[PDB]
Curated annotation (Swiss-Prot), chain A:
Annotated positions of the Phosphoserine modification: S331
Outcome following mutation: I69T: Might influence susceptibility to different types of cancer; loss of the ability to interact with and phosphorylate CDC25A and to promote CDC25A degradation in response to ionizing radiation
Binding sites annotated in the UniProt record for ATP: 139-146, 161, 206-212, 255-256, 272
Protein name: Serine/threonine-protein kinase Chk2
Effect listed in the UniProt record for changing I163F: In prostate cancer; uncertain significance
Catalytic activity: L-seryl-[protein] + ATP = O-phospho-L-seryl-[protein] + ADP + H(+); L-threonyl-[protein] + ATP = O-phospho-L-threonyl-[protein] + ADP + H(+)
Claim: Ubl conjugation is one of the keywords in the record: yes
Residues of the full protein shown: 89 to 501 of 543
Record PTM text: Phosphorylated. Phosphorylation at Ser-331 also regulates ubiquitination. Phosphorylated by PLK4. Ubiquitinated. CUL1-mediated ubiquitination regulates the pro-apoptotic function. Ubiquitination may also regulate protein stability. Ubiquitinated by RNF8 via 'Lys-48'-linked ubiquitination.
Disease: Tumor predisposition syndrome 4: A disorder characterized by an increased risk for developing various types of benign and/or malignant neoplasms that arise at an accelerated rate and in different organs. Prostate cancer: A malignancy originating in tissues of the prostate. Most prostate cancers are adenocarcinomas that develop in the acini of the prostatic ducts. Other rare histopathologic types of prostate cancer that occur in approximately 5% of patients include small cell carcinoma, mucinous carcinoma, prostatic ductal carcinoma, transitional cell carcinoma, squamous cell carcinoma, basal cell carcinoma, adenoid cystic carcinoma (basaloid), signet-ring cell carcinoma and neuroendocrine carcinoma.
Primary role: Serine/threonine-protein kinase which is required for checkpoint-mediated cell cycle arrest, activation of DNA repair and apoptosis in response to the presence of DNA double-strand breaks. May also negatively regulate cell cycle progression during unperturbed cell cycles. Following activation, phosphorylates numerous effectors preferentially at the consensus sequence [L-X-R-X-X-S/T]. Regulates cell cycle checkpoint arrest through phosphorylation of CDC25A, CDC25B and CDC25C, inhibiting their activity. (Microbial infection) Phosphorylates herpes simplex virus 1/HHV-1 protein ICP0 and thus activates its SUMO-targeted ubiquitin ligase activity.
UniProt family annotation: Belongs to the protein kinase superfamily. CAMK Ser/Thr protein kinase family. CHK2 subfamily.
Amino acid sequence: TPAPWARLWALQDGFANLECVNDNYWFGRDKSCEYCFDEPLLKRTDKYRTYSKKHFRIFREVGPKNSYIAYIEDHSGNGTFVNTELVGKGKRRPLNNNSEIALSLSRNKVFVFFDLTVDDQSVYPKALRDEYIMSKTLGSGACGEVKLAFERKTCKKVAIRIISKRKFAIGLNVETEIEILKKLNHPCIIKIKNFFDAEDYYIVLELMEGGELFDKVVGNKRLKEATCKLYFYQMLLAVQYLHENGIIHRDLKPENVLLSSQEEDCLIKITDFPTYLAPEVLVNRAVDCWSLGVILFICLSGYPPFSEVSLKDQITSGKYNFIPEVWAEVSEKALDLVKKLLVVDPKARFTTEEALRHPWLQDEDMKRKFQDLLSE
Amino acid sequence: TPAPWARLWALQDGFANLECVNDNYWFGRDKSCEYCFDEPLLKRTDKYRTYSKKHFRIFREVGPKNSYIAYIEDHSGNGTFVNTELVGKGKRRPLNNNSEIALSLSRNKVFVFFDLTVDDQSVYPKALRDEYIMSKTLGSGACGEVKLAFERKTCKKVAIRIISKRKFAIGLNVETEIEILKKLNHPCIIKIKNFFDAEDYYIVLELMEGGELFDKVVGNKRLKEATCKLYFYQMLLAVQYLHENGIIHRDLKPENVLLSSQEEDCLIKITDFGHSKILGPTYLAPEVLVAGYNRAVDCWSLGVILFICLSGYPPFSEHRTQVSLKDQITSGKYNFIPEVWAEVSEKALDLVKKLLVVDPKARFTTEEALRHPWLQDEDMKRKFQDLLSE
């Protein structure tokens, strides 16, 4: 009934392949061994007599996070070698995937071990795997694991984020909340494509092939002012839409402003509902507006307005780090808007509506560009 | 020169095992194929003629998180089957580890594919792997990945947490900060066993075999008052030590009170205190929901951890009638269920109350807690001392 957690592969003929289902396997000549060097083929060998009555064992054990770890334990006298190195008499070590087991001699390769407790797709609710193929981890979010997946038949990439129900289990909520987000229909917002419920919550989301605004801005590179304008415009529309649907972001940053292609001109899409923390929080819509200011500052300049006395002191006093050499090539209007957005007092800070009316954004050409991309 | 990213395993004799080094492999009868069904052994077969000139390909591709993803693409007419299911003519799909490749017939198993992009040792800085064997992921922290590891020779379990230097790369800091935490020497605090620096920061920490206080307290189970007392005593010593070394926790909760074995009586160890400083709510103090008093914050937290330990439920929760969680906390009216508390001592309840006081100036300090009657148990104190010998 149970699925195998490991395959052992015989390298020399006169050895059987093993598929590990039980928790423990002894290898040796002894009749009592779960895996016995007894096959009358192997018996005529002289190196056969180099192997011990009870040579070595492979086994599982519960991992500190309810996981499973495979170990090998050498009990031989002429040695059990793993990837060339001797384990040793009475000694014990973890068994990595694709390990080589040699016996009596380092050169004498016998088995290759494969851990199946990896990709191990049984780990997921069947309803989900019937629909998707779970792939690599894409990152560690504010929720938990976001993993790559593929639609079984179309073979389309999707992102699946995984949150643990154990996380709130001391003393359900998400099910109603998902449906509200699911109804949302706008081309600059991430679509919540699907939703599953097992021991964990799985939330299938559309995957953005272009990745994060962050990457276009890390390493002292900067974006053409017009590209900044395009992106920020879209960011304003996005945030406003959220605000109008009673959602406040609270954690807007380049790593969750997503781009839709490797083309410079393209659709921005927002996700996930301290350099970026508002000063008033360091002491609710204004919060997102401060964030955009920062995102804007970084886009135009290629460096952050506040970096590492304290980072907190700089923010609460609202004296952003202004480098003339970097800003000289940026427009007066662009600089102006940034300043309006980076205002300590939230009652003074520009609102998104005020930002959209700001002169810097009065570009009927880039507005048309945005409209074009919606056709794309 | 390059290491193989996959092994293919021949299931039928008259087929070679393949070790994938190149980015693309075509399988087929055709001479041009990187893997050719041509061996004069295989040629006499009748099912040999069921295979296509250009049957299928296996290949790599760069993944979104700088990853590599292995795909199979069927180009046959009689089919390429993967784990029983037909891929299909012109079709393409990802190749999971331990996949079975059949050809022409579902039953006709030929290859088993093994992905080697499965945790490899060489992804990490050599200095580290010379010392440790990297194992399974233990979780995703406030830092990044915490993984299981083993000391190369002793074979002792350790936890290694991995943080990315790319994370702050827009516009080093951690190196000086680590040394301060490294000097800390108290049995109820996690020891920072070692530290490495490559493209990523690796921080080797001691692994707690008992996991999180959280697990012993989730699902309506509760702990014997004496076990609460043992744990909480240790928690007080731990927090006091931190406070005396100028570190305020700010995020004390069951998920970061660690236990040292599956035995009920055992060492508690605390974590994420400067790990909640390396990067820069049931447990949030009411005053934070509204200088050297920032300590009260940790003291409120312990009251909560204490409440939960003795009762098996939280002092403040979310319910659709009692309005906000914030309202309950700021007004300090914890949810008291007589049926649950009847078996808990008066003194224990007393201390909880002293810790759960809205005004920080009134709240018990850790010194005040330790002098509280509930904790005047010379027997449990001796127990603690015993475990230090263990």
